[PDB]
Every structure is written in C-alpha cells, then in structure tokens.
C-alpha cells in the first residue's frame, strides 16, 4: 500500500476503496 | 488536513483509514 | 440536470463534483 | 437513504447536495 | 455545485453527470 | 471553449449544462 | 484492441481516450 | 446505436471512432 | 480496510492504488 | 483467480497485493 | 486513436481499455 | 518505459498495445 500523491476525485476514490460501506468524510 | 497529508505530501492507504466514519 | 443512477465509486465521484471544495460526508446508511 | 436511492433507484444532484459540508 | 478546475476525462465525466441521456458534445 | 471556461478557468455545473445536446 | 462492454461514464471515458484532442459527440440514441 | 450496443452488447474502439469530431 | 467487490476498470484502479509505484500485472485468468 | 473473485464474489486489498511487482 | 498525455490511473485505465481480458503489465 | 513514452511524452493506443500480455 505504497505512498502516493492523491488529489481531488482520485483521493475520494481512494477513500472509497479504503473505507467502503463504513463511509467517510472528505473535508479539504 | 487530508489534502495536505495525501495530495500536497504523499500518504499510505493506512493513513486514509484515518478518514473513515 | 438529469436524474441519476449512481452506485459505488460513481456516487462518490458525483458527490465530489457537486460538493467540490465544500467537501462532503459519504454515509451509506 | 438518498445514497441507497441513487443506486437501487434514482436520485437528483440536488438531493446529493444534502451530503455536502 | 461549486466551481472547479475540470480537465480531460474529469471534464467529460462531469459533462456526463450533468447531461446524462440528453448527450453532450466535447469540443476542445 | 469549454476547456478555457472549465479547465483553464473554473466553472459551475450550470455552465456545463451549456454543452448538453 | 479488444472488443468492449461499456456503459455510462465508462463509455464516455472510452470516447475520450479514442477521440482525444479531436473531441467527440456523445449521443445515446 | 453503437452507444447502446456498447452497453447492452459489445463494441469495438473502431466503431467508437465514428463519434469523434 | 473493507472487503471489495471490484469489476473491470474498477479492479485496475484498485490495483493501481494498492501497488502504486511498484506497478503490477493484471492477469484475468 | 483473485481477479475473477473480486468481481464475481469479493476480495481484500491484501489479496490484491499479490499482483504487485 | 490520437496521442495523449496519460499518467497514473488514467494510463492504467487506457491499458485496460486497449488490452482487456488479455491483461497487461504496468511497470513504471 | 511506458511512463516515459505515454506520460512524459505522448503516445497512441497502438503503442499501449505493446504492454498487453
Ligand atoms: Cl489528474
Ligand atoms: Cl459499473
Ligand atoms: Zn485525474
Ligand atoms: Zn463502473
């Protein structure tokens, strides 16, 4: 699970992958 | 914030778990 | 705008586009 | 909820604005 | 529906979201 | 063009509606 | 290239990749 | 049309070139 | 992390996020 | 395989690490 | 099939589109 | 590498076929 530069929709996609049905909050 | 940790800098999926509900 | 049929990451992408800078909370429940 | 609705049924971008901060 | 920097495939995705079955034209 | 209005500059989803068929 | 099974935004993404700079018209009809 | 075909059935990248400007 | 239900490009996106710089091999077989 | 499994069934991010170089 | 700047997940998506069930290798 | 040919520089889908298995 290497480190990466995640921005915008790519970051939200990553959060979705990691959090799933648990849900998550995206607050810049 | 998440943006400064993952977008400005880089981060691991484990750090992303910090933002799950 | 048209009505939507969104599942999974597609819904999250829609939330990102609609909320943008304001951010959002994804709560599937 | 609206989230479930978007997937099983349909939803509007307006309903999605409800989830914004 | 805040303002955003939308480029390339991200812009087409946004157009798809907004236009749907109505269709749209992407002409740079 | 759409690119100059939404990519170079920023734009709202309402402006995107200008490009629907 | 392989044949494709594309629906929704996935089809639009395919159109973007294939047409690129030339742009394209998405007409579901 | 080809668009509908890509989703209900299958289509080639060549058929998609038909939609390019 | 949660379990996943991933098909098509969504699986490839997941592989990219998990493998990142290390790269990966996508072998549907 | 795991790839097929992710789509027909379910899979973990850990199983996906198997495909990394 | 014009030439484009494809990076990160966008490049993997393009590889997926082009290669499909044949599979592919992403090695930076 | 693929990154230098398609990301640094630009490339065609035909060049992408070079990376299929
Ligand atoms: Cl990007
Ligand atoms: Cl899907
Ligand atoms: Zn991107
Ligand atoms: Zn999808």
Q: How many angstroms does the end-to-end distance of chain A come to?
A: 23 Å
Task: Please outline the major beta sheet of chain A.
Answer: none
The total number of structural domains of chain A is 1
Oligomer: heterododecamer
* Secondary structure category of chain A: alpha+beta
Main sheet: strands, sense, barrel of chain B = none
Which percent band covers the strand fraction of chain A?
5-15%
- Following the backbone from N to C, one meets helices and strands of chain A in this order, namely HE
Strand content of chain B: under 5%
Give the total of beta strands of chain B: 0
List strands and helices in order, with pairings.
The complex is a heterododecamer, with six copies of chain A and six copies of chain B (21 residues).
Chain A: H1 8-19, E1 24-26
Chain B: H1 2-8, H2 13-16
The structure holds chloride ion (2 copies) and zinc ion (2 copies).
Disulfide bonds (chains B, D, F, H, J, L): 6-11
Protein name (chains B, D, F, H, J, L): Insulin A chain
PDB class: hormone/growth factor
What does the model show?
The complex is a heterododecamer, with six copies of chain A and six copies of chain B (21 residues). Chain A has 28 residues and is α+β, with helices and mostly antiparallel strands. Chain A has one domain (1-28). Chain A has one helix at residues 8-19; one strand at 24-26. Chain A is built from one helix and one strand; from the N terminus they run αβ. With 21 residues, chain B is mostly helical. Chain B contains two helices and no strands. Chain B is flat. Chains B, D, F, H, J, L: This is Insulin A chain. Chains B, D, F, H, J, L: Disulfide bonds join 6-11. The PDB classes it as hormone/growth factor. The entry lists the keywords Air dried crystal, data measured at 100 K, hormone-growth factor complex.
């Amino acid at each position: 699970f290497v480190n990466q530069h995640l921005c915008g929709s790519h970051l939200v996609e990553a959060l979705y992958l990691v959090c799933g049905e648990r849900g998550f909050f995206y607050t810049p | 914030g998440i943006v400064e940790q993952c977008c400005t800098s880089i981060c691991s999926l484990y750090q992303l778990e910090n933002y799950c509900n």
